[PDB]
Structure formats: C-alpha cells, structure tokens
C-alpha cells in the first residue's frame, strides 16, 4: 500500500466497493465509531495524569543569601525540567501507539474480507479479493454482514 | 468487478513527533500546548490585585509620601511590585527581616489599618518636626505616614514608656524604628541624651536597640540611617515600649481581616482593566489547553506549565 | 474466541478436545510453564527498578525561617509526586504488555495447529481445523507432538 | 469431532487498569500496594523508641521539673515527641539554635548523663533559692533540674571564674542560660551589679552576653525571660565561664555515647507494647509490598511510600 | 526459527538462495538500507531528549547550618535518582522495539515470497516456498523484483 | 532447489536489558555510558585552574604568610581546594559570612589587587608590631599580608578616622577585621583604651562592632581571637572607617576585573599539566559519549551524569 486514497471523505476506514456499472467508497461505521472513541480516552488519559505536578511559587532572598537562593532556583528549575521530559515523552508515546492502531485497524480490516471467505474468496493483494462470480452492488454490500 | 480498502489523505502539511520518528506529516493533529497570553495583569475572578505601581511593599506598609495612594488599599487578589520600585524608603536605612514579612504577605489578602498611638498623644516630646528633605512630598520636608519621628522638646528627652494592648479580634502587624545618627553632636541636638536605646517587649519579643553612630555615604541626600522592625501582635497581648531617644514609633498599624492565596508578583505591567482566571507576570491566560508555557508562575486556575516550544498530538494518519 | 472456559482449570492456555464418545480440557504445559516464568521475571523488575527513589526526612524551622520552610516542603512533595507518577505509570505500562502477550500466545497456538498441517487440515476457525478422516482421543493428542 | 483453542476463565471480579483502558476484569491480579498499618507505636527491631509524653525536647534536656521521667533515659531507637507538648520551657523564654540541635540529636541513639559542676561547689553565691511559680513541682516553686540559678549572697555577687576540662572520652552538650530582669530594681535585687555579662570560651566558642531589660507580658505568671545557650565540648578541650551576674550556671551535662540512625517523629500516639522492622508517625507496618501509603517519614526497612490509592499489577488473562 | 546464518556477511536481513549446482546467500538491501536508518534515528533520539537534565553544584556550609546542609544534598541526590531511572528506562524501551523491530522485518520478508506468488507457490515455512518448475540461479533472483 | 529466509548470527557474548527480559546476547550493541577519566586536574579549554594547594580561600585572600604564592594570581577556569586545607587562619578565629564570599567568588575568575591603605600611612599608631607566633614565616613571628593589626603607641591609640574612596572602575572586595582579647590587662597594654568600638560605613554598610573578653583554649598557641568582615565597596563609593581599638585594618583589597562561570572544587589532586573540556574533582573527561558516572559535580562541556554502572543499547538483533 503506497499512499492514501483523496476521493475518501466519510470516515476513517472504509471499503471501495466497484461493481459492474457503478463505482464509490463507503465507510466502515463499525470500526470508525470503535476508533472515535479510542483516541478521546487517550487524550483525556493525559490531561488527568498530569493534574498532580510541580507549581513554582516566588521567593525573595537578600544579598546575604544568595546560596539559598541559588538552591531554591536550581530546585524549581529541577521540577519544571522533569515534568517537561514526562510531558513530551508522554506525548511520543501516546502518539506512537495512535498511528499503529491505525495500521492495526486497516490491516484487522484486510483480514476481515479475506479470512471470512476462505474457499470462495482468495486475496490478491491490497485488500481485494477473488470469486468464482460476479458481483452487484448487492453482492458489494454483502461482504460487511 | 473488484472491492478494495485503503485510507483517508488529505493535503495538509501539519506534522507530528514520535519516539522513533521526528517531523512526520499527519492527515490531523490536536495542539495541546497554549502559546498565547492577552499582555496584561487582570482581576483574579472579579478581584482585583493591588498593582503598587512605583512603589514597594516597605514603602507601602510604611506610608512613603510618594505612595499615598495606598493609605488604605480594599482587599486584593495578588501584588504586583516592579522589579526595581523607585519609591522605597525615601529616609535611607533598612527594614529588619523584610523578606520573612513578605512570606506573611504572600498569604494576606486584606488589612485594616487602625491608628494605635495618636500623635497628638507625645506631650513631653516633639511630635511633628521629625521630616527630612529625604522624603519630599509636594515640595516639602516629609516623612513616613504610619510611623512618627520624635524628638527632644525644650532640651529634653524625657524617657517613654508607653503600652499598646491589642483589644482586636486579629493579629496586628506592628511597625516602628530606630535613628542612626551622623555624629554625637547630633544625637544630643535631636535627643539631647548621649546614650541611648530603645527596649520592647511582648509575649515573645524581647528586643533592646541602641544606636549605632558611623560615617556613612549620603543616600537620598542623607548620612543617617533608619533601621525598622516589625512583629506580630496577637490579640490580648500588649506591646510595651522604653526609649530616651531615637526611637521612630508606631501610629498606625495593620489588622490581619483575612488570609488566603495570595502572591508578590514581579512585573512591569500596568492594570489591564481585564478579568481571568489565570495570571502570569507578562499576561493573562484564558484556555482549555492542559498545558502552556507562557511563564513558571502563574495564580490561579491554569494549564500545567512546560517549557516546551511545541507539543502535538496524533489524531488521524500518515499523510 | 469469545470468551474463557471455567471447565478448564488446570492451566492458562490449553486445548479442548473432543473425540467421538468423549469430552474435556487440557492445559499447554509447554506454554503455561513458559507463561509464569514471564510474569514472574516482568514483577520483579519493578520491585527492583524502583529502589532508588525519595526519601522524605522531618526537618524543623523556627517563626522567621517561613521561606525555607516552604522551600523544604515543596521541594519534599515535589518528589513523591514525580515517584507517585513514575510508580503509577510504569504499573500502567507493565499491565498493557501483560494483556498483550496473553492474546499474543493464545493466537500463536490458534496458528501453531492450523500451520502444522497445511495440506492435511484447514482452519474453521475460533480454532478448530478440518480433516479427512475422524479423531480419537489417541488422535486428538497427536496434534500437540506431530 | 471437533478439536478448539482456548483460554482460562473464573468467576472473580478482581480489576486493573492501562494506559488505553480502565476497570478490566481479569482473572488474576497481584496487589503490590500496602493500605495497612497496626495504629501503635513500636520497639523497631528490638530497641525501644524514647517516648516524650508531654515534655518537649527542651523540657527533657534542661530538666522542666513535670519531666522527671526523663532525667536518665536508657538508648533509643527513635524519639517520639507531641506537636504542642505542655511541658516545654517552664520559665518562659527561648533555646539558642533548637532546631540545630534537634537535627544532631536525630544522629544520636543514647545519652550518659554527668554531673559537671555541683551545686554545692558555689561558696560565695546563693545556690539553693532560684526557683519560680512558673515551673511548679508537686505544689511549689522549682526550676530546671540541670541547670543552676544563682543569686547574690550576703548582698554581693563576686565576679565568677569557673572552668570545666572534657577529660572523657566523648563529645560532652553543655547548657547554660542568661536571665532577662524586668527592671533595674529586679536586676540589683537578684544580682546586685547593675551592669552585667556572661563571657563563654572553648577553642571555637566565644561569646559575650548581656541581660536585656525590657517590659514583657506575663507567660506562665512571669515577665522575666530566660535565654539558653549550647555548645559540644571535645574530648579535651576546656570550656570557661565568667560572669557577675545573670547566670544560669551548668550543673549536668551529657555524654555523647553512641551515635546512629535516629529521628524525631511528631505524632499524638503513645507506647503500644510491640515490635515492628517499619515505623511510621501513624503506625507500625508488617509487609512484604514493594510500596505503601500510610505515611511519607518512616524509618526502618520499609517498602517505597506513594501517594497512590490504588496499584494492581495484571498477572493473568482478561476475564 | 532456531538460529542466524554465520554465512550471511554483507546485510541483516536477507535471502539464502540456493540453486541446482550452487548455494549462497544476499543480502536484501531494500530492507538493510531502511534499517541502518531506523537504529541511527532513535539513539540521537535518546541523546537530544536529555540534554535538559539536572546539574548538580557544589555548594557550602558552616556548622550551624546543618539542616540546610542536609536539604541541599537530599535535593541533589534526589534530582540524580531521578534522572538516572528516567535514562535507565529510556534504553529499556529502546531495546525493546529495536529487538521488536528485528522480528517485524524478519516476518514482513517471509510474508513477502509468500504473499507475491498465490496460486504459484505456497510457503512450506521458515521462509522456504514451493513451485511448479525448477529454479535456477536466475529464477532465485526473479522473487525480489 | 530451496531459497529459504532468516538473519544474521555471530559467537559474541555481549548482553543488553529490555523491560521484560534481561542479559539477552546480541549480535551487536552500543555502549553509551562513559567510565573513565585521566585521574588529573586540567586546563579548561586552555585556561589553567588556581590550585591553593595546602592554603583555604580565607589564607589566600586575608594572606596567610604560607600562602605567600598566591599573593598575586592570574586568571583562573576553576578554583581547587582541599578538603581540610592547613594553611587556613594561622590566628585563630573566624571569617564572617564565609561562605557567601565563596559563592560571589564562584562567579569571579580574576581578582587585581591593589595597596588601599599604606602601612607607611599609620602616623600615631604601631603599626609594624602587629605579629603573633600563631603566623609564622621564615622562623618568626608574623601576620595576614593584606591587613594590619595596629596597636598602640607611646602609651596612647588616638581615635582612628580613615575613609578610602572607590575611585577605580571595578567593585572592589575590602577586608578588615577585630581582635578579640583575653582580659582586660591585655586590653589595655595592646590598646590603652579599657572600652573600644570599630564603626564601618558605605552607602549600605552600617557597622559597629565590639571587642569580646572571653577566657578561650590556645589554638596555635594563642587564646586570643580574630573575627574578619568583608564588603563589596561599588564604583565611587567610599568606606569610612573609625575605630579607638582592636582595629585590624585594611592594606590591600582586590578589585573584580572578571566575572564569569567558575566554581571552587573540593579535590585532594594536583595539577596534572593537561588541557581538557570537562573537569571532575577526581579526573578529566574525554568522551563522546552522551553518559558518564564518574562524578556529579563537573565543569564545562560535559556527558549527562548518571549514577548507573552500565548502560548499552541495543542495535543488531538477538544472538
Ligand atoms: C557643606 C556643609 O557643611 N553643608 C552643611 C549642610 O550639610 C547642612 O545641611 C544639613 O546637614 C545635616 C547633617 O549635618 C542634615 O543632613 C540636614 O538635613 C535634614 C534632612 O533633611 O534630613 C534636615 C532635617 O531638618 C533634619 N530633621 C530632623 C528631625 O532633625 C534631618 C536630621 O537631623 C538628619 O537627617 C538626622 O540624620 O536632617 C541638612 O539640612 C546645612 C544646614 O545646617 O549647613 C551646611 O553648613
Ligand atoms: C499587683 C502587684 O503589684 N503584685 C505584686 C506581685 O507582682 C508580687 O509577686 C512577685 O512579683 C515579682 C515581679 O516583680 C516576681 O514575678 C515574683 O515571682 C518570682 C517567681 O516565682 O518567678 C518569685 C521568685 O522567688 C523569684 N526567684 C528569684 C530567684 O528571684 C522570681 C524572680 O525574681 C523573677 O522570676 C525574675 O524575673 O520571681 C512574684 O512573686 C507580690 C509578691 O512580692 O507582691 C504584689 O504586690
Ligand atoms: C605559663 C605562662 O604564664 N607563660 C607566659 C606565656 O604565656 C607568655 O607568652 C605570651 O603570652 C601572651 C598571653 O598572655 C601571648 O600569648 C603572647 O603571644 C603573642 C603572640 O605570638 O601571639 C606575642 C605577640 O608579640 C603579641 N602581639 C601583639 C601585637 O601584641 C600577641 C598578642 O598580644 C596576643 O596574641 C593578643 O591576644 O601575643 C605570648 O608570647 C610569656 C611571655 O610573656 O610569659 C610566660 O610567663
Ligand atoms: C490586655 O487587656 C485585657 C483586657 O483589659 C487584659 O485582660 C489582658 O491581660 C491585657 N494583656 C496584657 C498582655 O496585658
Ligand atoms: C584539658 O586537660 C588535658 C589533659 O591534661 C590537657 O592536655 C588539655 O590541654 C586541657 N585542655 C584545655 C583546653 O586546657
Ligand atoms: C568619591 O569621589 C568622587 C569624586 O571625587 C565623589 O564625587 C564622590 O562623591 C565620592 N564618594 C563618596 C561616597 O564620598
């Protein structure tokens, strides 16, 4: 699979059912409902786990005290560089897993239309398959139930 | 007849990082990161902060003449004090343990200044001569508003001994000081007594001061010096003072009416004339991004502060 | 494969085979053996990783040292939450790989059954495969060794 | 016939969480977070802890009369002390750098008491009448146990010269005091020199004190302040005291006989007879977990404390 | 699977073709050249991300600022027991998909030859597929284009 | 015929770690975590540290007469100093606020310094008698090269009024001190006057100090005490000394000529006659490598630090 198909605008994943005269793309409702959902509960996931981290608060020191106040800046400082890698890092991570649950969903939906048909149907490469006749925009639709 | 699967692409050029992979172009992307800020210092969900404007927190507390117009400030959100306040104290000296008494202020959100010793009240002592070109005001010899200098009367001193009992249902931030002379013919010309102290005393202060005479450098025209303490008196106790000299004493001072989240903020800004939820030092911050990275210390409801540059999250997929 | 079996109680992961008169479970000892040495090595590691971690000591400050009181007690918060969150997210991400390399073995022995015999059998599915002749309780055995 | 693959399934209702998902049942799940603590205070792996009751450190080591108990303690393994403990300095006043000193007795596990300068040994000075209403014993006046303070005899109050050599072997805590009069009348009456000092020499001490008179509230009864001092004294090394009035001389001092891991806890608790490899301020703990979250400041061979409610570790299948 | 080839010299992953008279391995250098690009990228990953990481400075005191003292050092140490496992962790995740990242490129290239040639040949396994002619040092080369 | 797919395996017996799995052998690995140093005290990017060798900050600066080496140093990159240096205050005593002097010096890299006050300058005091056994050089008794102890002369110490002015471009750093006595006969017979004052003024310093009479131990010999001051006397700034006793003066004072990152680093080392980018008290680095665990505190352009042993990546696949 080189690149992505532009003509597609319902849902994420979706079938390009072609019959004998007609020719459209149609989205998986099943799958794109399940995924909607899946990236909302991970987005929320990170708002609520960061909700206990370090908040800077001022403090003023004299001439005299420098030494403290060096502590007290290097310390603050410390905390805002900590939770600033567990911030980015967390977002790496979350946005690694994001894109391989797309390429799990699409190649889960590969599968799908190939696994379900085992001696009727022979997958030829890039989702499309085989028959030993053919098929109608009724025989199309009938590969999702 | 032939069905096939495939995806979504468009031809946006937003793009995202990865652990593995950096700048990867994506179909969508959700910007968690807040960049912005409005410029300028607002109140605190309908409350409004004390913005000191030139002034400092010691001059403020104090009463420096150029800072009248904080005699009597209502309630306040937070402070905002410039980094370097021109109108500090205008009599050159020190305040004693002033950043421990910010601390405290940090965590005040009201007084109530009350009038303790009248000064119409000094009646063997010299009560409104005690000014210096130090602290002009309108084109004149002025002086701190909250505390009196006092000096001899008809070539003498006699000694002080005057009580305060706080009757007040809360802590009283007390205020007074000591003069350090230029030289011994200027102590006996404003004190008339050689040797001198000042003794006060509560429940857990147990001070003696006494003078301390140098050659100093002229500071806002001036060689002496004014040293100022301060204490917190509680209710039902009493503040008791003794001094034959140099003693600068309390007028007015402070009733704690109410404590809660406050903070000293250091800026440059003026009033905004603007509402928030979420201060900064460089401006106000209103949205409902998890995080930002305007500036470290902020009040208020806010986002969780970073210091990164960008952070974008995956929604769609590769472009 | 919907859900789990109750009747099996022997091991985690196993075969139910069902000759012509009989009926019952069986436990994959060869990986049920493997499975708890992998459970048992992955909660070790985060007993062991999070040794070095804060220890909050009782520091005492007098009225006028308020600053240094507070730096002390963010600076000691400061850090149980960064452990709290270490300790918590490393938890989150040691239970996600558990889960995962359950349904890694339990589809591995779906294929292990289907693949060992290509020509001879095909696979139905949920894991059972099809033959050219019946099944004993001798045969049903068979499958595991060759 | 037909053969087909599957997994284990129970009836349990046992949950644990993911980075994508919540609430998943599983067959088998493995709690690694202790909940539970015994609510007493304990030995800590045999060694009783020093419990202070009502007394505060202070009280302890300069001998406040109601903490008799205290005057000598066997070896500890921690000390346990109330956040307002009643019985703390009788005769109102302050310790000199407490809270250093509270930081090296958490280094500290045992104490041996000595006598360094008998009461009987002041010829010229009036030993046996310093006492006061304000640390009352058993209906009457009294004053700490291990300290001394002397009054004029026979309406004098010679210049003292006393020296002390730390023979011993260990490092020796030595306490000593001033007394603040309230007023010059009070000051000859006790002492008989009007003007007075306390000089203190070691090879790295040197201080000089003076009384300070000042009018103060009354606490517990009195107005008058006492101000305590402390210093370690090497093996071998000497400490020199001369005054002529004000002192509130040594009479026992302590040995610094064994150092180790110790602490100061706070906590409300008292003694509850049992043993335990964990304390915590709010109880003992007995467990195998790798974390707990009883409470922040142990000491023993504990688990790692968190913050969490809750932490389960999947070990199973989902159910 | 049980073990790697000593033979293979020049790639990673690559194909051991073996003709009627002769026998020897290649290298498949579509995938080996995606490869050396994968490692290089995630270790300058691992050194750009914790460049922001806690200095420790030395600071001093006197005798009676023991508690002080005592903080400063528990604030260093702590910031260094945090970085520490913060970096220890990193190369355990690293680790983890770059051994991962082997084992996906090992199977992609079985999936490969087998997927390409349906009806023509059929996967007997460990890489190893059938035909209906014989195949020559030329023919073995023909399955990568 | 038979092509059949696999991968790479060699006979090496290196190991890496991942979550699940540890000491899994690799066919190739990337060690990413330095271990070595040169053992050595090197030139920074060229520029040589100063190595005070035997000699403390206090030596060096006060001038200590066995620091005599550093009466005039060079630019530094760093500052060495030993743990416990022995050439420290050959008189006993102790250098006020030491540590924060230390920490301005941490931001310096080169001091000029200057003749204040000549020695020559002293008209109605002694001020070539000024020695003590406690500071020997050459086999007699001597002093601190960059003040002076002054004492009195023809039975007579006229009161001292002496002020220098800042006219130089740089801050300067100016050090004085007192001495503190053992009695009042030594009082007198150094000082003539029974009851002596020090008072230091600038624009902020307003100083006045007193002698301490205390009986001490002999510390190099002397029971007698020095107590040093310093200050930071800004551009045209003057400091206005008077004082009838006690006085330890200044005669050099060093101006701030290079302010910069530096740092004072406790090392036992010598110069190793070496040049490096990264310094650790116990040796130089010279890696690529983005880890090292040699040592937490470094200087320059350093590898993270980190406390683990080992730390290798994995890069080839499993063997
Ligand atoms: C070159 C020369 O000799 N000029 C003097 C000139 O200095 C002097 O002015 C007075 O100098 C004195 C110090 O000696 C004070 O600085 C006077 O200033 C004031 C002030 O404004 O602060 C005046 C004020 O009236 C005084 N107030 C009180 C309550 O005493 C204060 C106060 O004494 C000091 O601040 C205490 O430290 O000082 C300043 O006018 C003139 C006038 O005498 O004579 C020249 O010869
Ligand atoms: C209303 C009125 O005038 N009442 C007085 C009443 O104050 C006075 O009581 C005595 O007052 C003095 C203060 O001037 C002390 O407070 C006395 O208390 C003691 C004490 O218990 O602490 C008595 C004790 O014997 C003294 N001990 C020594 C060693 O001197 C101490 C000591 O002087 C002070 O603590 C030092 O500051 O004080 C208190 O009894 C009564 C009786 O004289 O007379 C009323 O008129
Ligand atoms: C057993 C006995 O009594 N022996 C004394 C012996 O102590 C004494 O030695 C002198 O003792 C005095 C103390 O009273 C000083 O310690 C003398 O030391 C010096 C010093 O080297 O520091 C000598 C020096 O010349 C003095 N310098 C100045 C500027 O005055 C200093 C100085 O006075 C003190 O350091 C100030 O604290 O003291 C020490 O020689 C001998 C000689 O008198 O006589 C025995 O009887
Ligand atoms: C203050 O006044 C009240 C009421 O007169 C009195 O009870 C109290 O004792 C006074 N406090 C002090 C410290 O004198
Ligand atoms: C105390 O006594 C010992 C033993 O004689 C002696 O050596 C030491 O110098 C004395 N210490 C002092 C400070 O006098
Ligand atoms: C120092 O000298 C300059 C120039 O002579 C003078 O203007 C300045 O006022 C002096 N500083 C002080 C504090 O006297």
């Given at each position: 699979?080189?690149?992505?198909?532009?003509?597609?605008?319902?849902?994420?994943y979706?079938?390009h059912?072609?019959?004998?005269?007609?020719?459209?793309?149609?989205?998986?409702?099943?799958?794109?409902?399940?995924?909607?959902?899946?990236?909302?509960?991970?987005?929320?996931?990170?708002?609520?786990?960061?909700?206990?981290?370090?908040?800077?608060?001022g403090?003023?020191?004299?001439?005299?005290?420098?030494?403290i106040?060096?502590?007290?800046?290097?310390?603050?400082?410390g905390?805002?560089?900590?939770?600033?890698?567990?911030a980015?890092?967390?977002?790496?991570?979350e946005?690694?897993?994001?894109?391989?649950?797309?390429?799990?969903?699409?190649?889960?939906?590969?599968?799908?239309?190939?696994?379900?048909?085992?001696?009727?149907?022979?997958?030829?490469?890039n989702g499309?398959f085989?028959?030993?006749?053919?098929?109608?925009?009724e025989?199309?639709?009938?590969?999702?139930? | 007849?032939?069905?096939?699967?495939?995806?979504?692409?468009?031809?946006?050029?937003?793009?995202?990082?990865?652990?593995?992979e950096?700048?990867?172009?994506?179909?969508?992307?959700?910007?968690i990161?807040?960049?912005?800020?409005?410029?300028?210092?607002?109140?605190?969900?309908?409350?409004?902060?004390?913005?000191?404007?030139?002034?400092?927190?010691?001059?403020?507390?104090?009463?420096?003449?150029?800072?009248?117009?904080?005699?009597?400030?209502?309630?306040?959100?937070?402070?905002?004090?410039?980094?370097?306040?021109?109108?500090?104290?205008?009599?050159?000296?020190?305040?004693?343990?002033?950043?421990?008494?910010?601390?405290?202020?940090?965590?005040?959100?009201?007084?109530?200044?009350?009038?303790?010793?009248?000064?119409?009240?000094?009646?063997?002592?010299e009560?409104?001569?005690?000014?210096?070109?130090?602290?002009?005001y309108?084109g004149?010899?002025?002086?701190?508003?909250?505390?009196?200098?006092?000096?001899?009367?008809?070539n003498?001193?006699?000694?002080?001994?005057?009580?305060?009992?706080?009757?007040?249902?809360?802590?009283?931030?007390?205020?007074?000081?000591?003069?350090?002379?230029?030289?011994?013919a200027?102590?006996?010309?404003?004190?008339?007594?050689?040797?001198?102290?000042?003794?006060?005393?509560?429940?857990?202060?147990?001070?003696?001061?006494?003078?301390?005479?140098?050659?100093?450098?002229?500071?806002?025209?001036?060689?002496?010096?004014?040293?100022?303490?301060?204490?917190?008196?509680?209710?039902?106790?009493?503040?008791?003072?003794?001094?034959?000299?140099?003693?600068?004493?309390?007028?007015?001072?402070?009733?704690?009416?109410?404590?809660?989240?406050?903070?000293?903020?250091?800026?440059?800004?003026?009033?905004?004339?603007?509402?928030?939820?979420?201060?900064?030092?460089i401006?106000?911050?209103?949205?409902?991004?998890?995080?930002?990275?305007?500036?470290?210390?902020?009040?208020?409801?806010?986002?969780?502060?970073?210091?990164?540059?960008?952070?974008?999250?995956?929604?769609?997929?590769?472009?």
């Open positions: 699979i080189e690149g992505g198909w532009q003509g597609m605008v319902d849902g994420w979706g079938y059912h072609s019959n004998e005269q007609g020719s459209g793309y149609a989205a998986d409702k099943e799958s794109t409902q399940k995924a909607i959902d899946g990236v909302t509960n991970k987005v929320n996931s990170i708002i609520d786990k960061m909700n206990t981290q370090f908040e800077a608060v403090r003023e020191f004299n001439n005299l005290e420098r030494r106040e060096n502590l007290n800046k290097k310390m603050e400082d905390f805002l560089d900590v939770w600033t890698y567990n980015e890092l967390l977002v790496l991570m946005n690694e897993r994001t894109l391989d649950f797309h390429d799990s969903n699409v190649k889960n939906l590969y599968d799908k239309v190939r696994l379900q048909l085992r001696d009727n149907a022979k997958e030829l490469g499309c085989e028959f030993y006749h053919r098929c109608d925009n025989c199309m639709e009938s590969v999702r139930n | 007849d032939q069905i096939c699967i495939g995806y979504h692409a468009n031809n946006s050029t937003e793009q995202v990082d990865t652990i593995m950096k700048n990867v172009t994506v179909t969508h992307a959700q910007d990161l807040e960049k912005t800020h409005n410029g300028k210092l607002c109140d605190l969900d309908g409350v409004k902060p004390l913005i000191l404007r030139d002034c400092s927190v010691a001059g403020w507390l104090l009463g420096n003449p150029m800072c009248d117009e904080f005699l009597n400030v209502p309630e306040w959100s937070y402070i905002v004090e410039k980094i370097n306040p021109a109108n500090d104290l205008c009599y050159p000296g020190n305040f004693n343990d002033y950043e421990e008494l910010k601390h405290l202020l940090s965590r005040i959100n009201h007084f109530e200044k009350i009038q303790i010793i009248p000064k119409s009240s000094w009646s063997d002592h009560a409104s001569a005690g000014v210096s070109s130090a602290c002009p309108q004149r010899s002025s002086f701190f508003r909250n505390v009196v200098w006092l000096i001899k009367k008809d003498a001193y006699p000694t002080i001994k005057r009580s305060y009992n706080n009757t007040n249902q809360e802590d009283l931030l007390v205020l007074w000081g000591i003069h350090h002379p230029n030289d011994a200027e102590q006996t010309r404003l004190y008339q007594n050689p040797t001198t102290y000042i003794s006060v005393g509560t429940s857990t202060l147990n001070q003696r001061l006494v003078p301390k005479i140098a050659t100093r450098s002229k500071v806002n025209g001036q060689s002496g010096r004014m040293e100022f303490f301060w204490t917190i008196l509680k209710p039902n106790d009493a503040i008791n003072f003794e001094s034959n000299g140099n003693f600068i004493a309390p007028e007015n001072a402070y009733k704690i009416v109410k404590k809660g989240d406050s903070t000293i903020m250091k800026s440059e800004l003026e009033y905004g004339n603007c509402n928030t939820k979420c201060q900064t030092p401006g106000a911050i209103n949205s409902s991004m998890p995080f930002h990275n305007i500036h470290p210390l902020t009040i208020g409801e806010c986002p969780k502060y970073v210091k990164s540059s960008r952070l974008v999250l995956a929604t769609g997929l590769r472009n």
